[PDB]
Protein backbone atom coordinates (compact mmCIF):
# COMPACT_ATOMS: atom_id res chain seq x y z
CA UNK A 1 0.00 0.00 0.00
CA UNK A 2 1.08 3.67 -0.08
CA UNK A 3 2.14 5.19 2.78
CA UNK A 4 1.93 9.00 3.36
CA UNK A 5 5.19 11.28 4.70
CA UNK A 6 3.61 14.29 5.18
CA UNK A 7 -0.42 13.76 5.31
CA UNK A 8 -3.08 16.00 5.97
CA UNK A 9 -4.35 16.33 9.77
CA UNK A 10 -8.29 16.66 10.56
CA UNK A 11 -9.02 20.07 12.85
CA UNK A 12 -9.30 19.50 16.24
CA UNK A 13 -12.52 18.87 17.69
CA UNK A 14 -13.56 22.59 19.92
CA UNK A 15 -16.50 24.31 21.92
CA UNK A 16 -17.76 27.79 20.99
CA UNK A 17 -15.71 29.95 23.25
CA UNK A 18 -15.85 33.59 22.30
CA UNK A 19 -18.93 34.87 21.64
CA UNK A 20 -20.08 38.62 20.67
CA UNK A 21 -22.32 40.58 18.46
CA UNK A 22 -22.27 42.91 15.42
CA UNK A 23 -22.27 46.63 16.28
CA UNK A 24 -21.11 48.29 12.51
CA UNK A 25 -22.61 46.57 9.44
CA UNK A 26 -21.93 48.05 5.75
CA UNK A 27 -22.16 45.76 2.27
CA UNK A 28 -20.14 42.55 3.22
CA UNK A 29 -18.22 43.71 5.99
CA UNK A 30 -19.05 43.72 9.53
CA UNK A 31 -17.48 44.75 12.62
CA UNK A 32 -18.30 42.48 16.11
CA UNK A 33 -17.65 43.32 19.36
CA UNK A 34 -16.76 40.40 21.82
CA UNK A 35 -18.92 39.79 24.93
CA UNK A 36 -17.30 36.99 26.73
CA UNK A 37 -14.63 34.44 25.97
CA UNK A 38 -12.36 32.09 27.57
CA UNK A 39 -9.65 32.60 25.07
CA UNK A 40 -8.23 35.58 22.84
CA UNK A 41 -9.44 35.35 18.95
CA UNK A 42 -6.82 35.21 16.47
CA UNK A 43 -6.71 36.58 12.99
CA UNK A 44 -9.00 34.76 10.70
CA UNK A 45 -10.88 32.65 12.37
CA UNK A 46 -14.61 32.43 11.55
CA UNK A 47 -17.66 33.75 13.44
CA UNK A 48 -20.70 31.71 13.31
CA UNK A 49 -24.35 33.34 13.27
CA UNK A 50 -28.04 31.97 12.17
CA UNK A 51 -30.96 34.03 10.93
CA UNK A 52 -33.74 31.71 10.62
CA UNK A 53 -32.30 28.70 10.70
CA UNK A 54 -29.45 29.72 8.03
CA UNK A 55 -25.55 30.03 8.32
CA UNK A 56 -23.48 32.91 7.88
CA UNK A 57 -19.96 32.42 8.03
CA UNK A 58 -17.65 35.85 9.34
CA UNK A 59 -13.92 35.56 8.78
CA UNK A 60 -11.57 37.89 10.93
CA UNK A 61 -9.28 40.05 9.46
CA UNK A 62 -8.12 42.91 11.71
CA UNK A 63 -7.98 42.91 15.74
CA UNK A 64 -8.40 46.52 16.96
CA UNK A 65 -8.84 45.40 20.55
CA UNK A 66 -8.85 42.87 22.87
CA UNK A 67 -12.90 42.39 22.07
CA UNK A 68 -13.38 44.66 18.76
CA UNK A 69 -12.98 42.55 15.55
CA UNK A 70 -13.50 43.35 11.81
CA UNK A 71 -15.21 40.49 9.57
CA UNK A 72 -16.41 39.89 5.87
CA UNK A 73 -18.68 37.55 5.05
CA UNK A 74 -18.26 33.95 3.57
CA UNK A 75 -21.80 33.62 1.52
CA UNK A 76 -24.58 35.92 1.45
CA UNK A 77 -25.38 38.39 4.18
CA UNK A 78 -29.06 38.85 4.00
CA UNK A 79 -29.92 38.48 7.15
CA UNK A 80 -27.16 39.73 9.65
CA UNK A 81 -28.22 43.31 11.55
CA UNK A 82 -26.91 45.26 14.39
CA UNK A 83 -27.46 43.46 17.62
CA UNK A 84 -26.97 39.88 15.39
CA UNK A 85 -25.54 37.14 17.91
CA UNK A 86 -22.25 35.15 16.54
CA UNK A 87 -20.09 32.60 18.61
CA UNK A 88 -16.71 31.15 17.39
CA UNK A 89 -14.30 28.15 17.94
CA UNK A 90 -11.18 30.41 17.19
CA UNK A 91 -10.56 28.22 14.23
CA UNK A 92 -10.80 29.11 10.96
CA UNK A 93 -13.35 27.58 8.38
CA UNK A 94 -13.23 23.98 7.49
CA UNK A 95 -14.25 21.72 4.77
CA UNK A 96 -15.39 17.89 4.35
CA UNK A 97 -12.77 16.01 2.61
CA UNK A 98 -12.58 12.59 1.88
CA UNK A 99 -12.58 10.32 -1.83
CA UNK A 100 -16.26 10.95 -1.59
CA UNK A 101 -15.84 13.86 -3.03
CA UNK A 102 -14.52 13.09 -6.82
CA UNK A 103 -18.02 13.49 -8.86
CA UNK A 104 -19.75 16.16 -6.46
CA UNK A 105 -20.38 19.72 -7.29
CA UNK A 106 -19.50 22.35 -3.81
CA UNK A 107 -18.67 25.65 -3.32
CA UNK A 108 -15.28 26.58 -1.14
CA UNK A 109 -17.45 26.75 2.08
CA UNK A 110 -19.07 23.00 1.04
CA UNK A 111 -22.40 23.99 0.24
CA UNK A 112 -24.08 21.25 -1.67
CA UNK A 113 -24.33 22.52 -6.00
CA UNK A 114 -25.45 19.65 -7.41
CA UNK A 115 -29.20 18.11 -5.88
CA UNK A 116 -31.94 20.19 -4.17
CA UNK A 117 -31.98 17.73 -1.35
CA UNK A 118 -28.34 18.76 -0.59
CA UNK A 119 -26.65 15.23 -0.72
CA UNK A 120 -24.15 15.17 2.45
CA UNK A 121 -20.37 14.43 1.40
CA UNK A 122 -19.12 11.87 4.01
CA UNK A 123 -15.22 13.00 4.92
CA UNK A 124 -13.07 14.90 7.55
CA UNK A 125 -13.17 18.42 8.43
CA UNK A 126 -9.87 20.32 7.22
CA UNK A 127 -9.13 23.44 7.03
CA UNK A 128 -7.50 25.24 4.29
CA UNK A 129 -6.12 28.34 5.11
CA UNK A 130 -3.83 26.05 7.77
CA UNK A 131 -1.20 24.46 6.31
CA UNK A 132 1.05 22.26 8.59
CA UNK A 133 4.20 20.45 8.23
CA UNK A 134 7.37 20.26 9.49
CA UNK A 135 9.39 22.63 8.90
CA UNK A 136 10.07 25.48 6.53
CA UNK A 137 13.07 22.96 5.05
CA UNK A 138 10.36 20.26 4.45
CA UNK A 139 8.90 22.63 1.94
CA UNK A 140 11.95 22.22 -0.20
CA UNK A 141 11.67 18.74 -0.41
CA UNK A 142 10.30 19.41 -4.51
CA UNK A 143 10.60 16.87 -7.42
CA UNK A 144 12.52 18.46 -10.81
CA UNK A 145 10.35 19.08 -13.93
CA UNK A 146 11.26 16.42 -16.22
CA UNK A 147 8.15 15.64 -18.69
CA UNK A 148 5.62 17.44 -21.09
CA UNK A 149 2.30 16.85 -21.63
CA UNK A 150 0.85 16.17 -25.13
CA UNK A 151 -2.28 18.40 -25.92
CA UNK A 152 -3.02 17.67 -29.72
CA UNK A 153 -2.80 21.49 -30.16
CA UNK A 154 0.09 21.85 -32.84
CA UNK A 155 0.83 25.37 -31.76
CA UNK A 156 1.23 24.63 -27.85
CA UNK A 157 2.75 21.56 -28.54
CA UNK A 158 5.73 22.79 -30.82
CA UNK A 159 6.01 26.49 -29.87
CA UNK A 160 4.94 26.35 -26.06
CA UNK A 161 5.15 22.98 -24.30
CA UNK A 162 2.81 22.46 -21.32
CA UNK A 163 5.37 21.04 -18.13
CA UNK A 164 3.78 17.73 -15.97
CA UNK A 165 4.19 18.85 -12.52
CA UNK A 166 4.27 22.47 -13.31
CA UNK A 167 2.07 25.93 -13.95
CA UNK A 168 0.65 26.76 -17.42
CA UNK A 169 -1.12 29.80 -17.68
CA UNK A 170 -3.70 31.25 -20.40
CA UNK A 171 -3.69 34.80 -20.43
CA UNK A 172 -5.74 37.13 -22.57
CA UNK A 173 -8.84 40.11 -22.76
CA UNK A 174 -12.69 39.28 -22.26
CA UNK A 175 -13.87 36.97 -25.26
CA UNK A 176 -10.80 35.76 -26.68
CA UNK A 177 -11.03 31.78 -26.02
CA UNK A 178 -9.33 31.13 -22.93
CA UNK A 179 -11.93 28.65 -21.63
CA UNK A 180 -12.48 27.06 -24.90
CA UNK A 181 -9.26 25.99 -24.99
CA UNK A 182 -9.12 25.29 -21.26
CA UNK A 183 -12.25 22.64 -21.90
CA UNK A 184 -10.08 21.67 -24.62
CA UNK A 185 -6.84 20.99 -22.70
CA UNK A 186 -9.47 18.63 -20.49
CA UNK A 187 -10.92 16.90 -22.37
CA UNK A 188 -7.71 15.66 -23.97
CA UNK A 189 -6.19 15.32 -20.43
CA UNK A 190 -8.64 13.56 -18.44
CA UNK A 191 -9.96 9.99 -18.74
CA UNK A 192 -5.71 9.46 -19.96
CA UNK A 193 -4.36 10.46 -16.27
CA UNK A 194 -3.15 8.27 -14.02
CA UNK A 195 -5.12 10.18 -11.19
CA UNK A 196 -7.78 12.64 -10.23
CA UNK A 197 -8.77 16.21 -11.32
CA UNK A 198 -9.89 19.02 -9.44
CA UNK A 199 -11.62 21.99 -11.54
CA UNK A 200 -11.72 25.08 -9.20
CA UNK A 201 -14.28 27.91 -10.77
CA UNK A 202 -13.67 31.70 -9.27
CA UNK A 203 -15.67 33.96 -10.27
CA UNK A 204 -16.96 32.72 -13.68
CA UNK A 205 -20.46 32.01 -15.33
CA UNK A 206 -22.64 29.74 -14.07
CA UNK A 207 -23.80 28.60 -17.68
CA UNK A 208 -20.43 27.77 -18.09
CA UNK A 209 -20.28 25.61 -14.62
CA UNK A 210 -23.19 23.76 -15.39
CA UNK A 211 -22.06 22.89 -19.20
CA UNK A 212 -18.94 21.83 -18.08
CA UNK A 213 -20.47 19.67 -14.93
CA UNK A 214 -23.14 18.73 -17.37
CA UNK A 215 -20.30 17.27 -20.26
CA UNK A 216 -18.31 15.37 -17.41
CA UNK A 217 -21.27 13.33 -16.50
CA UNK A 218 -21.92 13.02 -20.50
CA UNK A 219 -18.27 12.05 -21.52
CA UNK A 220 -17.69 9.32 -18.05
CA UNK A 221 -14.89 11.43 -16.36
CA UNK A 222 -17.34 12.81 -13.70
CA UNK A 223 -16.29 10.65 -10.79
CA UNK A 224 -12.81 11.22 -11.55
CA UNK A 225 -12.96 15.01 -10.98
CA UNK A 226 -13.97 16.88 -7.98
CA UNK A 227 -15.32 20.91 -8.51
CA UNK A 228 -15.65 23.35 -6.49
CA UNK A 229 -17.73 26.51 -7.81
CA UNK A 230 -17.42 29.84 -5.98
CA UNK A 231 -18.84 31.88 -9.27
CA UNK A 232 -19.59 35.37 -10.31
CA UNK A 233 -22.58 35.68 -8.29
CA UNK A 234 -20.78 35.36 -5.30
CA UNK A 235 -19.69 37.42 -2.55
CA UNK A 236 -15.94 38.86 -2.16
CA UNK A 237 -15.43 36.94 0.58
CA UNK A 238 -15.88 33.20 -1.19
CA UNK A 239 -14.49 34.34 -4.50
CA UNK A 240 -11.73 35.11 -2.68
CA UNK A 241 -11.56 30.93 -0.94
CA UNK A 242 -12.11 29.14 -4.12
CA UNK A 243 -8.72 28.66 -4.98
CA UNK A 244 -7.60 27.76 -1.33
CA UNK A 245 -10.50 25.26 -1.30
CA UNK A 246 -9.20 23.60 -4.77
CA UNK A 247 -5.56 23.75 -3.50
CA UNK A 248 -6.51 21.78 -0.30
CA UNK A 249 -8.27 19.42 -2.27
CA UNK A 250 -5.42 18.77 -4.41
CA UNK A 251 -3.24 18.44 -1.34
CA UNK A 252 -5.46 15.88 0.33
CA UNK A 253 -5.38 13.88 -2.87
CA UNK A 254 -1.75 14.09 -3.46
CA UNK A 255 -0.92 13.80 -0.17
CA UNK A 256 -2.96 11.65 2.00
CA UNK A 257 -3.53 9.25 -1.71
CA UNK A 258 -0.51 9.54 -3.29
CA UNK A 259 -2.68 10.19 -6.60
CA UNK A 260 -1.70 12.68 -9.72
CA UNK A 261 -3.82 15.52 -9.69
CA UNK A 262 -4.45 17.65 -12.86
CA UNK A 263 -5.43 21.12 -11.42
CA UNK A 264 -7.17 23.63 -13.54
CA UNK A 265 -8.17 27.13 -12.25
CA UNK A 266 -10.96 29.66 -14.37
CA UNK A 267 -10.48 32.15 -13.74
CA UNK A 268 -7.90 32.91 -11.07
CA UNK A 269 -7.81 36.81 -11.40
CA UNK A 270 -11.13 36.50 -9.81
CA UNK A 271 -9.38 35.63 -6.94
CA UNK A 272 -6.77 38.62 -6.70
CA UNK A 273 -9.86 41.02 -7.66
CA UNK A 274 -11.54 39.36 -4.84
CA UNK A 275 -8.83 40.64 -2.62
CA UNK A 276 -8.84 43.74 -3.67
CA UNK A 277 -12.29 44.23 -3.40
CA UNK A 278 -11.74 43.15 0.40
CA UNK A 279 -9.25 45.07 0.94
CA UNK A 280 -11.01 48.43 -0.43
CA UNK A 281 -14.21 47.65 1.88
CA UNK A 282 -11.88 47.63 4.77
CA UNK A 283 -10.41 50.95 3.88
CA UNK A 284 -6.64 50.32 3.28
CA UNK A 285 -4.80 52.88 1.64
CA UNK A 286 -4.40 51.34 -2.21
CA UNK A 287 -1.54 50.83 -4.26
CA UNK A 288 -0.84 51.50 -7.88
CA UNK A 289 -4.13 51.52 -10.00
CA UNK A 290 -6.34 50.86 -6.24
CA UNK A 291 -4.56 47.64 -5.78
CA UNK A 292 -4.55 45.90 -2.05
CA UNK A 293 -0.97 46.45 -0.86
CA UNK A 294 -0.62 42.41 -0.13
CA UNK A 295 -1.40 41.76 -3.99
CA UNK A 296 1.78 39.92 -4.07
CA UNK A 297 1.93 37.81 -1.26
CA UNK A 298 -1.63 36.99 -1.64
CA UNK A 299 -0.69 35.60 -5.30
CA UNK A 300 2.22 33.44 -3.86
CA UNK A 301 0.43 32.19 -1.05
CA UNK A 302 -1.96 30.56 -3.03
CA UNK A 303 0.68 29.97 -6.17
CA UNK A 304 3.63 27.98 -3.90
CA UNK A 305 1.16 25.55 -2.28
CA UNK A 306 0.73 24.10 -6.13
CA UNK A 307 4.18 21.86 -6.13
CA UNK A 308 5.10 18.05 -6.99
CA UNK A 309 6.86 15.92 -4.48
CA UNK A 310 7.39 12.34 -4.38
CA UNK A 311 4.29 11.38 -3.52
CA UNK A 312 3.09 12.92 -7.04
CA UNK A 313 2.49 15.21 -9.39
CA UNK A 314 0.13 18.58 -9.42
CA UNK A 315 -0.14 20.27 -12.78
CA UNK A 316 -1.95 23.19 -12.86
CA UNK A 317 -4.07 24.90 -15.70
CA UNK A 318 -4.71 28.69 -14.84
CA UNK A 319 -7.08 30.90 -16.98
CA UNK A 320 -5.31 34.51 -16.44
CA UNK A 321 -7.97 37.45 -17.40
CA UNK A 322 -6.66 40.50 -18.35
CA UNK A 323 -8.67 43.87 -17.69
CA UNK A 324 -9.14 46.28 -20.56
CA UNK A 325 -6.48 44.39 -22.51
CA UNK A 326 -3.80 46.12 -20.13
CA UNK A 327 -0.82 43.13 -19.89
CA UNK A 328 0.82 45.75 -17.41
CA UNK A 329 -1.81 45.82 -14.68
CA UNK A 330 -0.67 44.91 -11.53
CA UNK A 331 -2.04 41.42 -11.52
CA UNK A 332 -0.92 40.37 -15.01
CA UNK A 333 2.63 41.41 -13.48
CA UNK A 334 1.96 39.32 -10.71
CA UNK A 335 0.64 36.11 -12.29
CA UNK A 336 3.94 36.16 -14.96
CA UNK A 337 5.89 35.05 -12.29
CA UNK A 338 4.46 31.81 -11.16
CA UNK A 339 3.91 30.13 -14.80
CA UNK A 340 6.37 27.68 -16.45
CA UNK A 341 4.59 28.13 -19.43
CA UNK A 342 2.77 31.39 -20.36
CA UNK A 343 0.49 31.46 -23.32
CA UNK A 344 -1.11 34.70 -24.20
CA UNK A 345 -4.18 35.43 -26.41
CA UNK A 346 -4.78 38.41 -29.06
CA UNK A 347 -8.00 40.01 -30.10
CA UNK A 348 -6.58 41.06 -33.66
CA UNK A 349 -5.69 37.52 -34.29
CA UNK A 350 -9.37 36.38 -33.00
CA UNK A 351 -11.28 38.97 -35.10
CA UNK A 352 -8.81 37.84 -38.04
CA UNK A 353 -10.16 34.07 -37.50
CA UNK A 354 -7.17 32.75 -35.74
CA UNK A 355 -8.11 30.37 -33.57
CA UNK A 356 -6.93 29.75 -31.22
CA UNK A 357 -5.77 33.27 -30.71
CA UNK A 358 -2.24 32.67 -29.49
CA UNK A 359 0.38 34.80 -30.06
CA UNK A 360 3.87 33.13 -30.43
CA UNK A 361 5.79 36.61 -30.34
CA UNK A 362 4.10 37.25 -27.37
CA UNK A 363 4.32 33.81 -25.09
CA UNK A 364 7.49 32.06 -23.79
CA UNK A 365 7.87 28.55 -22.53
CA UNK A 366 10.76 26.92 -19.91
CA UNK A 367 10.22 23.67 -21.13
CA UNK A 368 11.66 24.80 -24.57
CA UNK A 369 15.01 23.46 -23.55
CA UNK A 370 17.43 20.37 -24.02
CA UNK A 371 16.60 18.76 -20.78
CA UNK A 372 13.17 18.38 -21.83
CA UNK A 373 12.78 17.67 -26.00
CA UNK A 374 15.43 17.06 -28.37
CA UNK A 375 16.95 19.03 -30.97
CA UNK A 376 15.20 19.02 -34.01
CA UNK A 377 12.45 20.41 -31.95
CA UNK A 378 13.78 23.39 -30.72
CA UNK A 379 15.44 24.20 -33.88
CA UNK A 380 12.16 23.95 -35.45
CA UNK A 381 10.77 25.91 -32.89
CA UNK A 382 13.00 28.88 -32.96
CA UNK A 383 13.21 28.53 -36.77
CA UNK A 384 9.08 29.53 -37.09
CA UNK A 385 9.22 32.36 -34.40
CA UNK A 386 12.45 33.74 -36.28
CA UNK A 387 10.24 33.58 -39.47
CA UNK A 388 6.93 34.61 -38.28
CA UNK A 389 8.88 37.71 -36.29
CA UNK A 390 10.18 39.15 -40.24
CA UNK A 391 6.72 38.29 -41.66
CA UNK A 392 5.57 40.24 -38.94
CA UNK A 393 8.17 43.30 -39.91
CA UNK A 394 7.75 42.58 -44.13
CA UNK A 395 3.87 43.03 -44.02
CA UNK A 396 4.32 46.76 -42.30
CA UNK A 397 6.96 47.38 -45.51
CA UNK A 398 4.04 45.89 -47.64
CA UNK A 399 1.26 47.52 -46.25
CA UNK A 400 2.65 51.03 -46.10
CA UNK A 401 5.20 51.25 -49.42
CA UNK A 402 3.00 48.71 -51.69
CA UNK A 403 4.36 44.72 -52.28
CA UNK A 404 6.81 45.53 -55.28
CA UNK A 405 9.47 46.94 -53.03
CA UNK A 406 10.36 43.72 -51.46
CA UNK A 407 12.95 41.34 -52.65
CA UNK A 408 12.92 37.85 -53.57
CA UNK A 409 13.90 36.71 -50.31
CA UNK A 410 11.56 39.05 -48.86
CA UNK A 411 8.52 38.06 -50.88
CA UNK A 412 9.75 34.22 -50.16
CA UNK A 413 10.37 34.92 -46.41
CA UNK A 414 5.90 36.63 -46.53
CA UNK A 415 4.71 33.47 -48.26
CA UNK A 416 6.48 31.36 -45.59
CA UNK A 417 5.17 33.31 -42.93
CA UNK A 418 1.94 33.42 -43.58
CA UNK A 419 1.44 29.56 -44.69
CA UNK A 420 2.86 28.53 -40.95
CA UNK A 421 0.72 31.20 -39.41
CA UNK A 422 -2.62 29.85 -41.19
CA UNK A 423 -1.18 26.19 -40.83
CA UNK A 424 -1.25 26.55 -36.78
CA UNK A 425 -5.01 26.83 -36.43
CA UNK A 426 -6.96 24.11 -35.50
CA UNK A 427 -10.18 23.07 -35.07
CA UNK A 428 -11.18 22.30 -31.66
CA UNK A 429 -12.97 18.99 -30.68
CA UNK A 430 -14.75 20.97 -28.17
CA UNK A 431 -15.36 23.50 -31.09
CA UNK A 432 -17.77 21.71 -33.12
CA UNK A 433 -20.80 23.48 -31.59
CA UNK A 434 -19.48 27.15 -32.86
CA UNK A 435 -19.09 25.91 -36.54
CA UNK A 436 -19.68 22.11 -36.99
CA UNK A 437 -15.66 21.78 -38.25
CA UNK A 438 -14.79 17.95 -36.41
CA UNK A 439 -11.90 18.33 -34.05
CA UNK A 440 -8.12 17.24 -34.98
CA UNK A 441 -5.50 15.86 -32.64
CA UNK A 442 -2.20 16.63 -34.30
CA UNK A 443 0.80 14.38 -32.76
CA UNK A 444 4.01 16.20 -31.86
CA UNK A 445 6.11 14.55 -35.09
CA UNK A 446 3.40 15.26 -37.08
CA UNK A 447 3.57 18.81 -36.49
CA UNK A 448 7.18 19.27 -36.32
CA UNK A 449 6.96 17.33 -40.09
CA UNK A 450 4.43 19.56 -41.44
CA UNK A 451 6.19 22.64 -39.81
CA UNK A 452 9.26 21.03 -41.39
CA UNK A 453 7.63 21.14 -44.90
CA UNK A 454 6.00 24.17 -44.95
CA UNK A 455 9.27 26.03 -43.60
CA UNK A 456 11.69 24.33 -46.81
CA UNK A 457 9.47 26.14 -48.97
CA UNK A 458 7.54 23.09 -50.59
CA UNK A 459 4.20 24.08 -50.41
CA UNK A 460 4.65 27.75 -51.63
CA UNK A 461 2.03 26.72 -55.10
CA UNK A 462 -0.57 25.71 -52.76
CA UNK A 463 -2.68 29.29 -52.07
CA UNK A 464 -2.70 30.23 -48.18
CA UNK A 465 -6.81 29.56 -47.86
CA UNK A 466 -6.00 25.94 -48.12
CA UNK A 467 -3.77 25.84 -45.09
CA UNK A 468 -6.62 27.44 -42.66
CA UNK A 469 -7.99 24.96 -40.12
CA UNK A 470 -6.46 21.53 -41.20
CA UNK A 471 -4.78 18.68 -39.25
CA UNK A 472 -2.03 17.23 -40.59
CA UNK A 473 -0.32 19.38 -43.86
CA UNK A 474 -1.19 15.77 -45.71
CA UNK A 475 -4.78 17.22 -45.71
CA UNK A 476 -3.69 20.10 -47.47
CA UNK A 477 -2.14 18.51 -50.21
CA UNK A 478 -5.80 16.08 -50.28
CA UNK A 479 -7.75 19.80 -50.76
CA UNK A 480 -5.36 20.93 -53.33
CA UNK A 481 -4.95 18.02 -55.81
CA UNK A 482 -8.89 17.50 -55.58
CA UNK A 483 -9.42 20.65 -56.61
CA UNK A 484 -6.76 20.95 -59.39
CA UNK A 485 -8.41 17.33 -60.33
CA UNK A 486 -11.83 18.76 -60.58
CA UNK A 487 -10.81 21.76 -62.62
CA UNK A 488 -8.87 19.80 -64.96
CA UNK A 489 -11.73 17.47 -65.36
CA UNK A 490 -14.53 20.73 -66.58
CA UNK A 491 -11.63 22.02 -68.72
CA UNK A 492 -11.21 18.79 -70.23
CA UNK A 493 -15.31 18.51 -70.38
CA UNK A 494 -15.83 21.85 -71.65
CA UNK A 495 -13.32 21.73 -74.01
CA UNK A 496 -15.05 18.92 -75.61
CA UNK A 497 -18.21 20.44 -75.65
CA UNK A 498 -16.73 23.60 -76.88
CA UNK B 1 0.96 52.18 -24.04
CA UNK B 2 3.51 54.18 -23.33
CA UNK B 3 6.22 57.14 -24.37
CA UNK B 4 8.24 54.61 -25.77
CA UNK B 5 6.07 52.61 -28.23
CA UNK B 6 4.88 55.71 -29.32
CA UNK B 7 8.40 57.15 -30.34
CA UNK B 8 8.96 54.15 -31.65
CA UNK B 9 6.09 54.56 -34.45
CA UNK B 10 6.88 58.16 -34.57
CA UNK B 11 10.52 56.89 -35.50
CA UNK B 12 8.95 54.24 -38.31
CA UNK B 13 7.17 56.89 -39.81
CA UNK B 14 9.61 59.62 -40.23
CA UNK B 15 11.89 57.00 -41.64
CA UNK B 16 9.21 55.74 -44.04
CA UNK B 17 8.52 59.54 -44.92
CA UNK B 18 12.16 60.18 -46.36
CA UNK B 19 12.37 56.55 -47.59
CA UNK B 20 9.89 57.63 -49.94
CA UNK B 21 11.29 60.87 -51.17
CA UNK B 22 14.51 58.86 -51.83
CA UNK B 23 11.59 56.75 -53.88
CA UNK B 24 10.42 59.70 -55.58
CA UNK B 25 14.34 60.60 -56.88
CA UNK B 26 14.83 56.84 -57.99
CA UNK B 27 11.70 56.84 -59.57
CA UNK B 28 12.45 60.32 -61.65
CA UNK B 29 16.02 58.81 -62.64
CA UNK B 30 14.44 55.79 -63.67
CA UNK B 31 11.59 57.91 -65.93
CA UNK B 32 14.71 60.22 -67.45
CA UNK B 33 16.23 57.11 -68.51
CA UNK B 34 13.32 55.62 -70.20
CA UNK B 35 12.17 58.81 -72.15
CA UNK B 36 16.15 58.96 -73.11
CA UNK B 37 15.47 55.17 -74.66
CA UNK B 38 12.18 56.10 -76.23
CA UNK B 39 13.62 58.82 -78.01
CA UNK B 40 15.92 56.58 -79.62
CA UNK B 41 13.30 54.05 -80.39
CA UNK B 42 11.13 56.45 -82.34
CA UNK B 43 14.07 58.13 -84.16
CA UNK B 44 15.02 53.82 -85.01
CA UNK B 45 11.44 53.20 -86.03
CA UNK B 46 10.98 56.43 -88.64
CA UNK B 47 14.27 55.22 -89.88
CA UNK B 48 12.76 51.32 -90.36
N1 LIG C 1 -11.09 27.34 -30.80
C1 LIG C 1 -12.14 28.10 -31.13
N2 LIG C 1 -12.82 27.81 -32.26
C2 LIG C 1 -13.87 28.57 -32.59
N3 LIG C 1 -14.38 29.62 -31.94
C3 LIG C 1 -13.68 29.88 -30.83
C4 LIG C 1 -12.58 29.19 -30.36
N4 LIG C 1 -12.12 29.75 -29.17
C5 LIG C 1 -12.95 30.75 -28.96
N5 LIG C 1 -13.91 30.89 -29.92
C6 LIG C 1 -14.97 31.89 -29.96
O1 LIG C 1 -14.73 32.85 -28.94
C7 LIG C 1 -15.86 32.91 -28.05
C8 LIG C 1 -15.38 33.18 -26.65
O2 LIG C 1 -14.68 32.02 -26.16
P1 LIG C 1 -14.46 31.79 -24.61
O3 LIG C 1 -15.75 31.55 -23.93
O4 LIG C 1 -13.43 30.68 -24.44
O5 LIG C 1 -13.78 33.14 -24.13
P2 LIG C 1 -13.09 33.69 -22.81
O6 LIG C 1 -11.73 34.19 -23.06
O7 LIG C 1 -13.22 32.60 -21.75
O8 LIG C 1 -14.08 34.85 -22.39
P3 LIG C 1 -14.57 35.62 -21.08
O9 LIG C 1 -13.55 36.74 -20.88
O10 LIG C 1 -15.97 36.10 -21.25
O11 LIG C 1 -14.41 34.59 -19.95
C9 LIG C 1 -16.59 31.59 -28.25
O12 LIG C 1 -17.97 31.71 -27.93
C10 LIG C 1 -16.38 31.33 -29.74
O13 LIG C 1 -17.33 32.03 -30.54
MG1 LIG D 1 -13.78 32.40 -19.80
Redesign the pocket.
Given at each position: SFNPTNPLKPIEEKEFTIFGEIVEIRSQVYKIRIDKAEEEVLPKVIFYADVNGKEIQLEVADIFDKNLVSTFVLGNETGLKIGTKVKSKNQSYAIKISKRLLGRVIDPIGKILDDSIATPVHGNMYAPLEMQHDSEATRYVVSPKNAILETGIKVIDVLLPIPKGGKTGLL?????????????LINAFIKFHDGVSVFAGIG??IR?GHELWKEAEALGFLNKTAFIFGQMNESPGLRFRSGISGVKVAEYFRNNLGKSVLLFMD?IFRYVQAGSEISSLLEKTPSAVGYQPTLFSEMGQLQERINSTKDGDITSIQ?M?IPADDFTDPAAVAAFAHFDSTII?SRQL?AEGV???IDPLESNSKMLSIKYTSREHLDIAKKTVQTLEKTKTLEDIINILGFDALSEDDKKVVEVGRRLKWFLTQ??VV?EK??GVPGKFVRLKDSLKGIKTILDGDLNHIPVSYFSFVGVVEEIIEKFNLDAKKEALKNELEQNQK | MKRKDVEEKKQNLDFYHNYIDISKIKVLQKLNEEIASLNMLKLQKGES
Open positions: GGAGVGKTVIVQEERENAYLAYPAPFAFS | -
